[model samples]
Target: LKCNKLIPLAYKTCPAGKNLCYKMFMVSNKTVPVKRGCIDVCPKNSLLVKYVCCNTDRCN
Candidate 1:
């Protein structure tokens, strides 16, 4: 499936001065579809097909 524009769900403030990040990945099934969301930080490792994160305005 093709990746689409990210939707801004909710606003949140990170504690202290932590960086806000966003991620996108695929599930086990090929047709399961892609998923994405905002996070305080990205995971170190996982079985995800793809992953990415960034610290910038509306980056997620």
Candidate 2:
């Protein structure tokens, strides 16, 4: 099935315990930057676009 959703794909070192934070984010339409050392966790072959840091400080 083609899942077209904005599911959060976080970085490996994301401090949110894989349940909270979004240290790095990736979506279906948009791909994250592979150079950030964060996008490597995604199983899908995604291209790097840019970096985004949440202003809330916490990914929640």
Candidate 3:
């Protein structure tokens, strides 16, 4: 996945079984990039901090 470590930059970090990229963010506001990283699983949840996941790389 492309990560800036909570910043606005595109860096790649991936591992086996974790090609799923995820985005941690909140909106009050609009969809924002609070954090970005890779995850094995995605929790389709709802709350203050949102969790979104995807299959393969570059999908946050």
Candidate 4:
């Protein structure tokens, strides 16, 4: 798994509908927001907040 190797590790998703949420693999010690590109690309209206993308996995 990339989680075992990359630094500032890439983001990953928890199992579907799971409470684990999306998070960076390398920094399991800290939480990082979802990528801005995701918010910019989100077709839904709820993801945007104060020009920042909220850290959520429910983008469907």
Residue 19 displacement (Å), model 1:
1.1
By the TM-score metric, which is better: model 1 or model 4?
1
Runs in model 4 deviating more than 4 A are: 1-9, 22-55, 58-60
Please give the lDDT score at residue 19 for candidate 4. 33
lDDT of 1 at 31: 38
User: Model 1: which residue pairs collide?
Assistant: none
Give per-residue CA lDDT, model 2, range 1-60, as digits (tens). Answer: 111113434233433323222233344325542232222233333373323433232332
In model 3, pairs of residues that clash are: none
Model 4 agreement with the true structure over 8-54: per-residue lDDT tens digits = 23444443333322222222323343322222222323323212223
Candidate 4's C-alpha lDDT? 0.29
Model 1 Cα lDDT, one tens digit per residue, 1-24: 111234555444544545655456
* Top TM-score model: 3
Between the candidate structures 1 and 2, which one is better when assessed by lDDT? 1
lDDT (C-alpha) at residue 12 in model 3: 68
Q: How many Å off is the CA of 50 in candidate 4?
A: 29
lDDT of 2 at 24: 35
Q: Rank the candidates by TM-score, best first.
A: 3, 1, 2, 4
| Candidates 3 and 4 compared by TM-score, better number | 3
